[PDB]
């Protein structure tokens, strides 16, 4: 995701 990701899905966890 173009915002907050890193591992897999950090915005909608």
* Length of the chain in terms of residues written: 13
Contacts of 10 (CB under 8 A, 6+ apart): 1, 4
The CA angle 6-9-5, to the nearest 5 degrees, is 30
Q: Supply angle C-alpha 7, 3, 9, rounded to 5.
A: 30
Residue with tokens 């995701």: 1
CA distances from 11 to 5, 8 (A): 7, 10
Rg (CA), the chain: 6
Instruction: Give the sign of the dihedral formed by CA 8, CA 1, CA 6, CA 12.
Output: negative
Please state the three-class secondary structure of 1-13 as a single string: CCCCCCCCCCCCC
Technique employed here was NMR
Q: What sign does the CA torsion over 10, 12, 4, 2 have?
A: positive
């Amino acid at each position: 995701i173009w915002g907050e990701s890193g591992k897999l899905i950090a915005t909608t966890a």
